[PDB]
């Protein structure tokens, strides 16, 4: 699973790079946009505590569980799309050496 | 989403329940079944776009869809595990687990 990117000041993948302030400025803007984008993903699909209720009731509800998990799936697919695009866009401001570093750190995850 | 459950002795969800040996034995069996079931879920482009520097939208979406398809199935079994686990518990223990899981979402 693509990682949920920390703030660049907190992200070990970017902290490991010796980035110029211009590079950091650009990556910060990218991460800001990432958070803006993911914050717009609709979460209305999730019902608060749909799974706990099934467990609490003692009666298995195949349809309800599948629906809730499908809703989680849909949201995560979208969030991860933007997380992947972030690291892709991030790589564009890097040197070839820095880029190979990121690719290695990401493949590991 | 849904916790990926450790064995009972390591699972924070059930560590304060004061499970008996018979309860542990049965829950360990459920956990063994969970792992077997998850293992039988039929299981790249994300790295290639970074390496090539060329965005492949469809490839990225395809891989993410495949991964989420797996996760949906695995999480189904994980929810079922806690559901089945709860049957082994006393009413008080069940009440605790429900509250622990609700706290974990
Ligand atoms: Na672009």
């Amino acid at each position: 699973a693509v990682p949920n990117p920390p703030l660049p000041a907190q992200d070990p993948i970017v902290q490991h790079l010796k980035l110029t302030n211009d590079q950091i400025t650009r990556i910060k803007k990218l991460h800001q946009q990432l958070e803006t984008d993911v914050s717009q993903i609709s979460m209305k699909g999730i019902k608060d505590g749909a799974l706990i209720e099934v467990i609490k009731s003692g009666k298995w509800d195949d349809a309800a569980v599948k629906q809730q998990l499908a809703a989680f799936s849909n949201i995560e697919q979208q969030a991860r799309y933007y997380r992947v695009k972030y690291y892709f866009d991030l790589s564009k401001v890097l040197t070839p050496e820095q880029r190979q570093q990121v690719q290695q750190d990401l493949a590991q995850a």
Side-chain angles (χ1 to χ4, degrees), chain A residues 1-14 16-17 19-43 45-46 49-52 54-55 57-96 98-100 102 105-107 109:
Chain A
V2 69
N4 182 17
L7 206 61
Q10 291 176 324
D11 190 348
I13 297 188
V14 314
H16 175 61
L17 306 171
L19 303 175
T20 69
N21 300 61
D22 181 88
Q23 281 176 311
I24 297 292
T25 300
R26 293 173 187 272
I27 292 176
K28 279 176 49 168
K29 184 177 177 180
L30 289 177
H31 192 269
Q32 324 158 4
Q33 187 60 230
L34 167 66
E35 299 305 324
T36 293
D37 291 344
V38 175
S39 75
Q40 290 186 248
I41 299 169
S42 180
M43 288 194 174
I46 304 173
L51 295 178
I52 303 296
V54 169
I55 291 160
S57 69
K59 343 174 292 171
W60 188 250
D61 191 337
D62 170 71
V65 172
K66 280 196 176 185
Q67 177 184 32
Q68 179 81 331
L69 293 177
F72 290 157
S73 169
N74 178 58
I75 291 158
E76 286 176 314
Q77 274 182 62
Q78 297 180 71
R80 291 172 185 167
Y81 173 91
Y82 292 105
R83 293 171 185 165
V84 172
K85 188 182 170 294
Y86 167 69
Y87 282 114
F88 176 81
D89 290 340
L90 185 150
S91 295
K92 295 178 121 170
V93 309
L94 299 185
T95 60
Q98 288 162 347
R99 180 174 300 110
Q100 267 150 29
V102 171
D105 284 88
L106 283 179

